[model samples]
Target chain A: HHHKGLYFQQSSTDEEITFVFQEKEDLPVTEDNFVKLQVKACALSQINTKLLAEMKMKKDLFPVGREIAGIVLDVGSKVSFFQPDDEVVGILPLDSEDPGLCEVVRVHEHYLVHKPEKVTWTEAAGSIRDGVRAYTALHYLSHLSPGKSVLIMDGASAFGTIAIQLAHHRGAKVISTACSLEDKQCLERFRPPIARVIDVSNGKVHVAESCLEETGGLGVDIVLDAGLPHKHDIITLLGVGGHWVTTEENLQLDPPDSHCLFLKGATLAFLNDEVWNLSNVQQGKYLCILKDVMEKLSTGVFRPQLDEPIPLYEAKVSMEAVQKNQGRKKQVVQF
Target chain B: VTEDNFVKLQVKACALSQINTKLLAEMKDLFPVGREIAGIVLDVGSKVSFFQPDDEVVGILPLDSEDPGLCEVVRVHEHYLVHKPEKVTWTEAAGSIRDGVRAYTALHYLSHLSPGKSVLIMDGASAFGTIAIQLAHHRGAKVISTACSLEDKQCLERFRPPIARVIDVSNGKVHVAESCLEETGGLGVDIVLDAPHKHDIITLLGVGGHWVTTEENLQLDPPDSHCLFLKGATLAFLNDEVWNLSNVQQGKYLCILKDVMEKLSTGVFRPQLDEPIPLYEAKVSMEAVQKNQGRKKQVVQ
Candidate 1:
């Protein structure tokens, strides 16, 4: 069998890269845990932009997209949990040759979970990765517990929305940041409603002051930032024994920042969900997280904000929109 | 002279710390140079209730304390003092308090170390490193350590069940990261108590590892972030002084002090120390310690 997959190609004369759909041979279910799925929907995010920026032109074609939702088309002989026609959702491995934005893809069963009937294809596709990231940051890294205070930056982002909801679900006192009035209003309209949403678009409002005031001068217990420009703000906003979970891959910490954190006995954890796909030793735990996320979605514990699904033909334009930061909601492409 | 919440003690023994040397080099006055002390109480302020005229106790002084432990007598807050065990010697009490508390903070609190996990303690011959290695080993962790001298290597190698692996970098041929990776079968150690002036230490950590560092001026770059992020690891700055700087962990800090004294009495922790230097030669001995001249713990009496 063959499938149409989206891939990136760089120009011969320059560094410009363009995305296109190309027909490729489908991979067979050769491994015992391999499960083949006909792709129903694939989600787009800023992660694709980061991946593209780090790409080398030497490769002929780089597969595009990762967050995927689909129906199982076939399974390997030893595959036990999933059979053909089962609804599934998963994030593709970082080094996978098969793209999620395709007609079909073959994945290891450990990377997938059963999708509930209550979940729409777009919701499952868009929310799985964000849900897992939120779980990693809040539960695993920060060790969020009831009565703790949390400051989640970029509260309107797909990942941020899930994180804010999960923190609130865990009974944490949630504070967040909004880049615009619309973002603030959208967050304010959440079912439980975000309690404190600081406006960050204008440099007039200080994040640290607001967070410190909200916590009565104790600062926040957990802070999750999406690579903010000022790293010192996080240091200033953290209380004693606080945890700062950041997604800044190239984060630089000077001496004063280290000294300040040391005085407070704080922890700095770098959040990168790619660790799940990079290391195979934690496959069981990773699978458990995926299953739990899907179960939460089914039980209405998590309601992710998402845009209407774009048709497969419009995937390239939607992806570009996401990369350029023009998309206001989580965008998914439907087959 | 004693004030409210203060206890005056007739100093029996005082221990030298790297922090004391650091403060000395910063052009700070070392009038009361020693901080960790074991002594008998002389008198107590009206507000002090934990001690009497003859009760023996041990503690680390506050960072801004003006009372010097190297002298015959000093005054400290009751909050900083813990009852010393009857079986523990004054030297043992004074020498082990700072390192014991630091080890507990790094391994038990920051790293959440448990049985069957692995720990890599850098400069295992130093007072703090030796205590950290013992504490981690006592918690059932597989211990790996680094040594810079033959004496230090032999000392660590002499542990009861034996250290898992001791990497000797005296000849400058040993690569700490490579040796650690090889020892742990390429998965890396579960926790790393880092040493100053070390590089590529991040590569020695496994998934979900905790890096507890005492380097006050530590700087991290992009490659460091990349390595730590890939493993989903945590970098925590371990300053045991936080217990004194903030009141949040004061109760736990007191508990740890009592635990350290109990461990010393139970033979679980034996501090390595040189013969006690006379109080008259304290200044010269401290200078040697500040110059990193020897590996044995130094004390004055």
Candidate 2:
């Protein structure tokens, strides 16, 4: 029987309190290299609720730490990917019965990749997918073409940074927006890699002036609506048939006049990270990829934007600190 | 001129085409023998059978099945009816309006203009292209669109993709030179959704052929509309925008979307409109939305 760990659940009525307990299970653990590792750090949010319902596991699902950084405690039969002590990070989409969200969880499988070898076990524990969305959306979903003009609104978030880097890596003309002047360092650092940067907040009035001038009065081919609330205002800045990707809820929908999407032949893609894309993976190949990226971060390709870790016991206090630690990095819950 | 009791359909498999708006509204009123029988069903009209009162069933209610909106309960000829899946509900079956309930039907039933064949969208902003792109994509078809305004052009490029080219009109006439057909190797589109009721579309088609959805007043005679008949073209007309259709086959497919919408609990591929007016301030919203509905705004009471 494999060991069980902390499982966090919200009370039926109240959500503020998180219930964590240790339990034992003998549901015929597979002989795979990676058995389901308990959630060490689940990002607490409405997303978890969505995950539960999507997985059809609202009855059995509970939140744990996000980016669970745990050791490989078991190996299923015919599995050779990991020894008993490999640390990893991965995603499990368990949303629909429509063959898409089939996995409830993968301790270490296909969606499971190797965390950067340099990243601390604690760092991977608090990993939030917002950081990985750029990789998945930019590289995996579609090839990020070069010399493309692009805009990344809400530049300070982890996803925003990844967007800048990935966009730059793809040879795009990158532009960005920030709340105050203090966030310029990251933008400037990101600029040498990109063609130019749009100062969306150098002043509100000149929101798109830099972009307008940069594109020679023609808008860009792609506009990543990082801040969807402002999408309507910026939509005009796109050249015909341009692209717009968002992480926000569907802000617009209806009888869907083919005319609407028809006019520009524009494409809009929304990101719903609560789904399970990994299933039937018995060997846990996903752990290797997470480890590889983590290793790159250890050297340079990525950084957690991690400010500092708050001790697990003071978990509630950390949520408030997370919001306050503005400049340096994201506040992580240290286990 | 008298209407025939039965309408011909490619009704072989996935026969949901049988359930059109006509069957849902008036068939029951005129054909009193049409209550969904409960058990040991005695009989059904020609081309209809496989009895059992307890068996769940559904079918298409044609728009011409009855006078429409008048008969509260409708029945259709047996050929139009089919067994409804037990998992489907009556209310859930209410969404037979979008493209005859088969917009997202499997690639086999829909998804024409497939690989090696291209699709030409008359009005890029029409619902047919909006749904057909994904449908055509399911089977692999290159798409081309047409538009006018700069804003509309930009909007079209963003929403309806896979459109290989765009025909922009500067002075209210299509710049056909920019059309894909002009550039393709001397061949016309395999399927054309004449969604735009423009002046010369039918005349341009020049031949008789089956059309999916076009301006019904189209002149399909010889010489001018020759491309249709000579091309062995068949035109299929679709008018159910709110999707309240009633064909047996169409009903089954309509229920699929209704179920999907219910599952999303939100509009998944829901109606896309331009200016949404609130049901309360509808007058103002509607006025502002005049001739401007593109998949932007929606109004729900």
Candidate 3:
């Protein structure tokens, strides 16, 4: 049987077509299999993996999986966390030597956690990117205090969805970008910190200023641009004493003022997902906070807004649907 | 007889009697046609009448507010000239009253300044410290005299009017702020006006604990100033490329604060006035006067 999944063709620019694999690894099906996940769902971030490859990202040194969610199908030799029919969602260890994160792979003990029983497995798949990123950027990197303002450039990515919630949690005013009318409606469920909007249901427009008007003329104190694609000249949105932080690694740009720096006392910070290395202090911080967020999503403290899931065989149509479904909101791909 | 109110126009006077030379020259140079001299006509000039021309006036001014080194044509109504007392000759009167005017103003006006105040002299050797030191002493403010850090400190330290010491920035330990303040009972000096040179920060902080660096350093601002300004310390800045003249007249008063200098040529004014005693030393005195007036300049040839 052909294992069909849409993936990037080799070494080509602007490539994310489709491919067929002759043999897919088979998972052991036994009563203990309840602990093993057949990966009922999988997801990729808008973060261009091709661009990361072009940039020759060292992300290969560790592991890289943008998003994933699923249920348990098989159990390990001594697994006890799950039963054969239990629902679950969790992260995998990051190792390039390990299988490509997109494939349905086995997860070890601690990394495999049960998804809230009532929440559908497809809903859980959308949590990874926004879950970890929102907590880190909002709470740690930016020190986004309560009542502070936040301008998230990536208004509709998986990360954006969660960041909006965290900003709301911290009592921050949120100004985000929504690429489609559907994405905009999904965002409306989690009302942002600021008034006005950039309904990019059309094309990406610089909406930084329209957000700042609600807080008077001064721009936000902390800016997070998660949409790595738009790292181009977005820093102009930062106001005096403002900090412009980016997760985009492809672009290398400096702040506008070198002397007016003292005139405004401003700063800028940039980070890559590779910073999640165990040695990096940030990774330790992330692990601690991620546990809290996952627990919340499992209960009701945090609820992730997700779209309908598409099945495995229709992978090509699902990619196109997800790509164009921005207006329809985050479309989940279910196996 | 002369009245203090009289504006007597004196001609080709001694180097002292008046503060600036242009005024002496103006009576003869610009107004060569009507720059006239007169006696006690206190009623006519309508000024203070404590005295008159020919009443033997001496120098009394702090600093010259006039634009020195260059003279400008006078407007139709500017009275740049003033009256002189008449007890002495055109030479003696012209020779020292300007110095006396400097002393009087510094003592009577600046002396009233509260103690612990500060006066930073940009270039001490420029004819005014002799009065400025005593005037500050009269008012009790600490005085800091800055000079060329290496080559000029020794030459600049001779205090005729009795000063604390000459502050040479380059010679002092760099960034010795904490040590310097500790020595002066920790209050620190109150003011600063730099003459602009290398190692200036060391001296600026060491001496007055304050500085208003020239505008020329605007492009290269020191990172520490933010901390300095935040500390409620006094800092001065030059206007464009120009320094605040403060009060030149006040500087004159300080220079001449003491009535008469002691053994000005022997062991006082220049401590190194080098007068080896000899029989009929009048010749030596003449030679010393020539050497002093000629300004010890050496030609390359």
lDDT per residue for candidate 1 within A1-37, as digits (tens), equals 6777888776777665678888899998865789989
Give the runs in model 3 whose Cα sits over 4 Å from its true position. Answer: A1-8, A11-17, A27-35, A50-66, A71-87, A93-104, A108-111, A178-194, A198-212, A228-241, A252-255, A258-263, A277-285, A320-328, B1-301
Question: Tens digits of per-residue lDDT for model 1 on B194-288?
Answer: 84244557878888788988777778888788778778899988876778867666798999999999989996888888898879978888888
Task: Report the lDDT tens digits of candidate 3 across residue range A160-273.
Answer: 666777777777777776665666666666543344456755545556555556557566667787652243334445555455555543333223233232223234344334
For candidate 1, give the lDDT: 0.84
lDDT of 2 by residue, A9-112 (tens): 55667544454444444333376433544334333222235335433564443434444555555556756555556665654444321110111234434445
Better of 1 and 3 by lDDT: 1
Tens digit per residue, CA lDDT, model 2, B179-199: 554644434455556544422
Per-residue lDDT over B1-301 for candidate 3, one digit per residue giving the tens place of the 0 to 100 score = 2233433322322231112233334323131211111112212244545334333222222223221111111111012233333333333332333333333333332122457665555545444434335545556766666554454466566554445556556554433333334434544444444424324443334221334333322332343332232222323332210111221223332244223332121212221112222223333333444453421211100
* Model 1: pairs clashing at backbone N, Cα or C within 3 Å: B32-B68
Name the docking class for model 3: incorrect
Residue A276 shift from truth in candidate 1, angstroms = 2.5
